Amino acid sequence: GKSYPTVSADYQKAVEKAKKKLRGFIAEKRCAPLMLRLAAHSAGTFDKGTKTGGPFGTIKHPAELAHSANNGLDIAVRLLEPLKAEFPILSYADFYQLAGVVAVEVTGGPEVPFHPGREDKPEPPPEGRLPDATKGSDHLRDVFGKAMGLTDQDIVALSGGHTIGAAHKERSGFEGPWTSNPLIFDNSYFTELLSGEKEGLLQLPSDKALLSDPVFRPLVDKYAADEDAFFADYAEAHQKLSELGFAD
Ligand code: HEM
Ligand code: NA
C-alpha cells in the first residue's frame, strides 16, 4: 500500500551520510535502546481512522515530551540535536526513524528498510494513545490493531524490541533490563519470557500478556525457537511501524 515520495539527490546524500554518523554516535554513546524507544514509541501515536499522529517529528515538541509515558525521551531528543544540525535538509521525522533503524542495526539486529520523505507536522497528537505496560492482550490489539493498523504478528515481533534496553524507576517506574545482554539485538526477550521470571530481569504485564493469548503465544514460541524468523518478522513490523501514515 506504499507509494514513497520523491526526494532530491541532495536529500538522499544526506540520508546516507547521516546513517553513518548515527552508527558511530549511537554506538559510542551506548544509547541504541533509548533511540529505538524514541523512534518506535513515538511512531505509535498513529490513529488510522483519523490519519492523525504517527512518526512525524512531533515528539521533538516539549508538549509531547511532557506526556508522562514519554518520561526520559527528552534525553533522546537532546542527544540527537547536535547531529541533526549537521543535516539541516533532513526532516526530524526522517531523522528519528533513521536513528531507530540504526539502533537496531548497530546492536546486531536486522537491516530494516528505510525510505525518506516524512514531513514534520505542526501539531502533536493528543496524550493517551501509547501502549500501557500495565494492560493486556485486548489493550494491545486496541492500540496496535484498531489505532495503528498493524497485525497480531507485528505486535509480538515489535514487543521483541525490548530485547535491548531497560526500564527505569524514575521514568516508567518499572526497573531493569529484559535480557542479560541489553545492548545486543537477538531473540532472548522471547527465551526469557518463556523460562519464567529470572532474578534481575524485567517482564512488564504487557510482555506477559503475549504468553496467555491464543494467537500471540505461538509467535512467542516461534521467535524463541527461530531467531532468523524473528529477525524477518521484526524487520517487516519495524518498517511498517516507522511508516505509519506515511506514503499511505
Ligand atoms: C508492546 C507495547 C509496548 C509497551 C507496553 C512498552 C512499554 C515500555 C516501557 C514501560 C518501557 C520502560 C521505559 C523506562 O522506564 O525507561 C519501555 C522501554 C523500551 N521500549 Fe517499549 N513498549 C512497547 C512497545 C515497544 C516497541 C514497539 C518498541 C520498538 C520496537 C519498544 C522499544 C523499547 C526499548 C528499546 C526500550 C528500552 C529503552 C531504554 O533502554 O531506555 N517498545 N517500553
Ligand atoms: Na538481548
| Residue 7 burial (CB count, 10 A) | 17
Please tell me if the domain spanning 1-130+238-248 has the same topology as the one spanning 131-237.
Answer: no
Return the CATH fold of 131-237. Peroxidase; domain 2 (1.10.420)
CA-proximal residue: ligand 1, atom 7 (nearest): 133
How far apart, in Å, are the Cα atoms of 208 and each of 79, 153, 184, 189, 213?
Answer: 32, 16, 21, 11, 9
**Cell for 50?**
483519523
**Cell for 99?**
536513528
Identity (one letter) of the amino acid at 231? F
CB contact set of 115 (below 8 Å; sequence gap of 6+):
2, 4, 243, 247
Sorted by where each begins, the domain ranges of the chain are 1-130+238-248, 131-237
Report the C-alpha gap between 210 and 17 in whole angstroms: 38
Partners of residue 166 on adjacent β-strands: 177
CATH number (1.10.260.40, 3.40.1190.20, 1.20.1250.20, 1.10.520.10) of 1-130+238-248 reads: 1.10.520.10
Contact 163, 178 (CB under 8 A): yes
Ligand 1 interacting residues, C-beta cut-off 6 A:
33-34, 36-37, 40-41, 72, 131, 133, 158-159, 161-162, 164-168, 171-172, 174, 204, 206
Contact 132, 30 (CB under 8 A): no
Contact 159, 207 (CB under 8 A): yes
